[PDB]
Write a protein that binds this ligand. Structure first.
Ligand SMILES: Nc1ncnc2c1ncn2[C@@H]1O[C@H](COP(=O)(O)OP(=O)(O)O)[C@@H](O)[C@H]1O
Ligand SMILES: Nc1ncnc2c1ncn2[C@@H]1O[C@H](COP(=O)(O)OP(=O)(O)O)[C@@H](O)[C@H]1O
Ligand SMILES: Nc1ncnc2c1ncn2[C@@H]1O[C@H](COP(=O)(O)OP(=O)(O)O)[C@@H](O)[C@H]1O
Ligand SMILES: Nc1ncnc2c1ncn2[C@@H]1O[C@H](COP(=O)(O)OP(=O)(O)O)[C@@H](O)[C@H]1O
Ligand SMILES: [Mg+2]
Ligand SMILES: [Mg+2]
Lengths: 388, 394
């Protein structure tokens, strides 16, 4: 019974490791005052007018020493406050309930996680969307916790116990969710409900686990009802990311989504595997419905992901347009060195500090712009869907 | 309901692309594996000498055996393939592995924490043992059973256009319960290295894992749901392979339980980062419980032991520390060799090549890098082979 023998030493080392991590436990972006004029609706004159009026009222802007005289170091919140002061409404002023996005595809490694966390940070901080003052939550439902690691700071969560899966089973109050399950990401305004390796055991025993702690509740509606419905007034966008496993987490994510996006890989074979997922989607929803709840799933938008300037890639892109037609996004996510490098250190191209970036400055810049163009394209497609 | 319309079109496009893929398929040739040895280098191998190699070659040629030769400047020179070397050992009367072990030994490199190298380790172990310079006299027959719908093992083992669109998968074989002969002819496919075969996987298997219980009750009425891989596949191929390695995704589902119930031994790749190592130890502590659950609902696992090894290890300060903790946890069951993080592995990984199969004439990296990683795979495979020999012979 040596498995027990090694298992017991393992159990003891865990407590030793947990102590080592708990004994170890920021956005870089600021704007010069003059730089705000480049933003929509702002001018050098109206920014100075709003700034002086706010300071007269008592507001204090962030500043940082610039050699001799000290200068304004506008944070994203400072900019958002300036738009508010000037009477520009926020996104929540026209939509009164969180919209749920699920970037999904049974084929793994196609960028579900990177496009998810990039979309969240880039919508928040997009130059043209700051006036929208977006509140965004990313719910991680993959036990591998890739979204969690991208959104938090290494020595911030350390060992996570309160996970999205735990919240689903415990069925707590809006207040407890906000206070004990949700954690802020590196970019203020974007939050994450983390995941951990222990959730793999939760997924495995979902049936029985639901009978015990959630007697009578439909097994596919647990995330929507015990978590998302309680946070509907606290966020403008809620993005769910799960692993590629066709299990309870994936089904609960599907049942809670308002819209789906499918990242489409460009290599003929990966594209082929992705189409099988696209072809069986209606089958999965039917299955969910027939045995419980209905998905208020609007449409499924496709976008090429990790696209390169290669004959075969352009060819599959041609085929994707044919398959998705109108539901094809006009913007794609290019394969770029910036995404690759940031991916290595679990940074989003929006959160990576350019001063620390171990790579070409241009590569980081180009990737940020790609993420911004993709986020703007997604935001506008969603605006069209919700405005009609 | 445009969801149905997009699906319809996706389906039509699928059929189109299937045909286009099938037409591009290129049949694989066993005599194409790149590795060849100079006749003179054979004397460096175990049990061979300059004189007994010269005698063996001459005696074999006299019986009609023909060794390939290639122009090398001023003369044509022998280009010895691994099969030619295996045949020289046989000519000399050296027994093979199957002459002392008559049933396949099942290995499962497992860990619920993902990206720890379960796949690259499995695939590198399979190719590197078969083609290890010091294990050629064993003439090994190795099968890799891919049970991950993402099919990473399948991709590493085959050539892009050698396999085509996959339908006959490991998961399908488990449900169809076909004969030994049908498995050998319709499901098993050869990898780029002769002697190492693969039972492939495909994205469709994700639906099979999800509906497992209903599918078993329907296609396999009355059979224990944890005993399917062992009884419908592996037990039938026991005389056909020396080692059978199983690779599944990092999901606690039927494929992983079926692999556990089938293995003779387990290896746990242990990642070097504190938190990853931490997630791995949670898996190691829960193993007994996993095995116990399977025992309670059906079959008993015959898992000998669980050997741990450091994977993607770097000569770093923090890594050295976790390596110490791993020793304390696994103790005598820690392998002495580790798989280091190396650019060769990373580059080969991007093109789904094994560092054993990668042709140095095509490698888009430094020659030293590929060579270093090939040697690291060979050292790891020999250590694993030696450890299993000790267990099986004592
Ligand atoms: N556009 C891109 N360009 C370059 N690398 C990318 C891009 N999108 C994702 N990646 C990288 O590809 C891998 C797979 O992406 P990931 O988001 O984890 O996929 P899923 O979430 O599909 O498994 C990661 O290692 C990631 O850093
Ligand atoms: N924000 C995060 N939260 C949790 N885990 C993380 C985070 N960022 C990275 N990780 C995990 O920790 C590891 C850190 O890599 P490592 O090379 O040890 O880092 P450093 O060199 O930062 O110690 C990764 O392989 C990953 O599994
Ligand atoms: N020793 C290594 N050095 C460098 N890269 C490695 C090494 N082992 C694995 N990798 C790379 O790490 C990734 C994860 O390995 P993989 O075998 O797929 O893990 P699992 O099978 O753990 O999901 C792949 O991109 C792979 O090529
Ligand atoms: N042996 C294989 N069998 C099936 N799919 C493979 C195999 N080797 C690689 N692949 C898949 O095909 C892709 C090949 O990359 P890609 O950039 O399209 O290649 P090329 O540029 O070779 O067309 C990988 O991302 C992987 O998903
Ligand atoms: Mg992911
Ligand atoms: Mg794998």
């Amino acid at each position: 019974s040596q498995l027990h023998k090694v298992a017991q030493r393992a159990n003891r080392m865990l407590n030793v490791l947990t102590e080592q991590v708990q004994l170890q436990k920021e956005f870089y972006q600021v704007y010069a005052k003059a730089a705000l004029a480049k933003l929509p609706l702002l001018t050098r004159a109206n920014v100075d007018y709003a700034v002086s009026e706010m300071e007269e009222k008592g507001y204090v802007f962030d500043k940082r020493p610039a050699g001799s005289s000290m200068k304004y170091a506008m944070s994203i919140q400072n900019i958002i406050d300036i738009y508010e002061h000037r009477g520009v409404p926020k996104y929540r002023d026209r939509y009164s309930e969180a919209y749920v996005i699920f970037i999904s595809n049974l084929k793994g490694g196609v960028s579900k996680t990177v496009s998810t966390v990039s979309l969240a940070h880039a919508m928040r901080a997009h130059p043209h969307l700051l006036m929208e003052d977006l509140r965004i939550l990313v719910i991680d439902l993959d036990p591998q916790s890739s979204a969690t690691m991208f959104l938090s700071h290494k020595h911030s969560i350390g060992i996570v116990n309160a996970t999205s899966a735990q919240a689903m089973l415990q069925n707590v109050s809006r207040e407890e969710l906000l206070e004990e399950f949700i954690v802020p990401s590196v970019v203020p305004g974007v939050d994450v409900m983390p995941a951990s390796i222990d959730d793999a055991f939760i997924a495995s025993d979902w049936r029985e686990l639901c009978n015990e702690h959630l007697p009578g509740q439909n097994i596919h509606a647990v995330l929507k009802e015990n978590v998302i419905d309680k946070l509907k007034s606290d966020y403008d966008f809620i993005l769910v990311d799960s692993g590629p496993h066709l299990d309870a987490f994936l089904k609960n994510a599907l049942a809670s989504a308002n819209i789906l996006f499918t990242p489409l890989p460009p290599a003929t074979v990966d594209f082929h595997s992705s189409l099988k997922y696209v072809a069986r989607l209606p089958e999965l929803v039917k299955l969910i419905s027939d045995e419980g709840c209905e998905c208020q799933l609007a449409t499924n938008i496709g976008f090429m992901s990790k696209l390169s300037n290669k004959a075969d890639h352009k060819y599959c892109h041609s085929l994707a347009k044919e398959v998705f037609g109108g539901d094809m996004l006009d913007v794609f996510l290019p394969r770029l060195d910036g995404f690759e490098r940031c991916g290595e250190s679990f940074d989003t191209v929006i959160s990576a500090n350019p001063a620390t970036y171990v790579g070409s400055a241009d590569a980081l810049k180009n990737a940020r712009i790609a993420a911004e163009d993709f986020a703007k394209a997604v935001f506008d497609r969603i605006e069209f869907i919700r405005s009609n």
